[PDB]
């Protein structure tokens, strides 16, 4: 009758949530403050991550060059991603300077990227972005952050590099995709079932729509909340209703998405 | 057919960060999401962001219109404001162009006329030689300062009310544990329906916090719907539930 939970796993859950909602500045703050990182990377993969998140593109290029002559290592796409992020950062520095030499740096990055581009049309789009007073005036690059772009670059680079890590017993757990939202909705469903069972026993039998519209995510009616009543109730109960076929209704969620400040 | 707002989830995360005193992350999330856990007037929010962003003279100018009131302690407010200012000045001076010791001494003798007792100020004077109470985090200190000034300025700054927008306390933890218990209940119902022996300790040990990737659906709710109403009042032991929480390995760097 005892359960063990780790706060580091809860912080991994909220880190996965922040990443799923593109709150990458909050994610990096939470990582550097609590020390935890969602996942288990190599001792050198952490170095590569710190390089990518700090904008050390030349160091990233000299770091993976030992892996140049390989087999499935797509050096074309790797260098394309790195130099494209470098060029976009130089362009964001240039268009905000309005100059000096940032235009020279942007054009040098564009010439370095001139070869690794997958198509000439994408290179034309890049050289067209070079002219705009703000690269965010393009529909594709409209919502573009340096931090989110660096996180995406690292996510694309590790999937190609991984090239090892140390195996552990249970230190290699990540947080499954949308695990915190799933656990929150499952806890809300547990509250709904407990309310449906406490009301059905207490006389008034409402339709299942009542207990679903009575969902309160912010305030919880249960002060202690966990009474461990549903499990012990299922414990001593006839085993015939477990083989009772039921309806397969679908759970319809409508998420009021976040209005992030620009 | 339910309504879920990501703002409420972010309020739960904010409450969780405040419970563990991860205030740098809490402030970063507030700034990046535009979400604030709790009800505040348009003036209380302004005082809040002034205190959090480190604008002390602006706070003093903002609350000066309330110091003339009778039922107000204008001695402790300026005391704590100038104390936090002096501590932040001392901290920014302790960093390895220097003219900050002048500002440190000015902030010290700016609060000399506001300390409750003289021995407290005398001890404060000894801090210029160093770290004798180093749980002092600026973000945490600014949050504590905002709380200590809000528990006294709200009498004149009404809340314009109810507390229906606050993320409760530890509600994220409760909902996570309840989701784990829902997974335990569904694994029990699957076990005793497929011809498998099962007990209560094994389903409790079978808790996968980080993820048993049983997908989300209302199957248990429909099973409760299509189930007779004559067995919903049985006799079962109210067990002794305990949750041991392995606390955080908060590192030492700032």
């Amino acid at each position: 009758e005892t359960v063990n939970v780790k706060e580091v796993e809860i912080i991994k859950l909220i880190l996965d949530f922040l990443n799923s909602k593109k709150l990458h500045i909050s994610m990096l703050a939470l990582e550097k403050e609590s020390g935890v990182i969602n996942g288990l990377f190599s001792d050198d993969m952490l170095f590569l991550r710190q390089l990518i998140l700090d904008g050390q593109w030349d160091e990233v290029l000299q770091f993976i060059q030992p892996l140049e002559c390989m087999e499935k290592f797509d050096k074309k796409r790797f260098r394309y991603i790195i130099l494209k992020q470098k060029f976009l950062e130089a362009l964001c520095v240039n268009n905000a300077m309005s100059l000096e030499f940032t235009m020279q740096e942007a054009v040098q990055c564009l010439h370095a990227l001139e070869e690794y581009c997958p198509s000439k049309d994408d290179y034309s789009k890049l050289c067209l972005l070079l002219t705009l007073p703000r690269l965010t005036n393009h529909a594709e690059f409209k919502d573009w952050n340096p931090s989110t772009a660096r996180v995406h670059c690292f996510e694309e680079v590790c999937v190609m590099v991984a090239p090892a890590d140390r195996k552990l017993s249970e230190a290699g757990f990540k947080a499954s995709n949308n695990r915190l939202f799933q656990l929150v909705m499952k806890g809300l469903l547990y509250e709904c079932c407990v309310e449906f069972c406490q009301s059905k026993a207490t006389g008034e039998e409402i339709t299942e729509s009542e207990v679903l519209l009575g969902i309160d995510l912010l305030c919880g009616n249960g002060c202690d909340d966990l009474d461990l009543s549903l499990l012990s109730w299922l414990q001593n109960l006839p085993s015939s209703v477990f083989s009772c076929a039921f309806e397969q209704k679908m759970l319809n969620i409508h998420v009021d998405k976040l209005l992030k400040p620009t | 057919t339910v309504n879920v707002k990501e703002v409420e989830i972010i309020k739960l995360i904010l409450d969780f960060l405040n419970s563990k005193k991860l205030h740098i992350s809490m402030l970063a999330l507030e700034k990046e999401s535009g979400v604030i856990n709790g009800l505040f007037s348009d003036d209380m929010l302004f005082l809040r962001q002034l205190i959090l962003d480190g604008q002390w003279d602006e706070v003093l100018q903002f609350i000066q219109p309330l110091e003339c009131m009778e039922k107000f302690d204008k001695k402790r407010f300026r005391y704590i404001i100038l104390k936090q200012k002096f501590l932040e000045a001392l901290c920014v001076n302790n960093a390895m162009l220097e003219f900050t010791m002048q500002e440190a001494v000015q902030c010290l003798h700016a609060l000399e006329e506001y300390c409750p007792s003289k021995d407290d100020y005398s001890k404060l004077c000894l801090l210029l030689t160093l770290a004798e109470f180093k749980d002092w985090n600026p973000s945490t200190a600014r949050v504590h300062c905002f709380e200590e000034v809000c528990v006294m300025v709200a009498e004149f700054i009404p809340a314009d009310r109810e507390a229906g927008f606050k993320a409760s306390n530890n509600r994220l933890f409760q909902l996570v544990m309840k989701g784990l218990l829902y997974e335990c209940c569904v694994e029990f119902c699957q076990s005793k329906a497929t011809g498998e022996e099962i007990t209560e300790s094994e389903v409790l040990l079978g808790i996968d916090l980080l993820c048993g990737c049983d997908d989300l659906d209302l199957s248990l709710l429909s099973w409760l719907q299509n189930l007779p109403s004559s067995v919903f009042s049985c006799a079962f032991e109210q067990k002794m539930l305990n949750i041991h929480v392995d606390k955080l390995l908060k590192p030492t760097k700032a």
């Binding site: 069972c197 406490q198 207490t202 | 109210q238």
Partner: peptide, 15 residues
């Protein structure tokens, strides 16, 4: 120790 379910609602209401 104790056996009740319909009493759990009343015990929660008594608060």
């Amino acid at each position: 120790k104790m056996t009740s379910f319909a009493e759990r609602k009343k015990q929660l209401v008594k608060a």
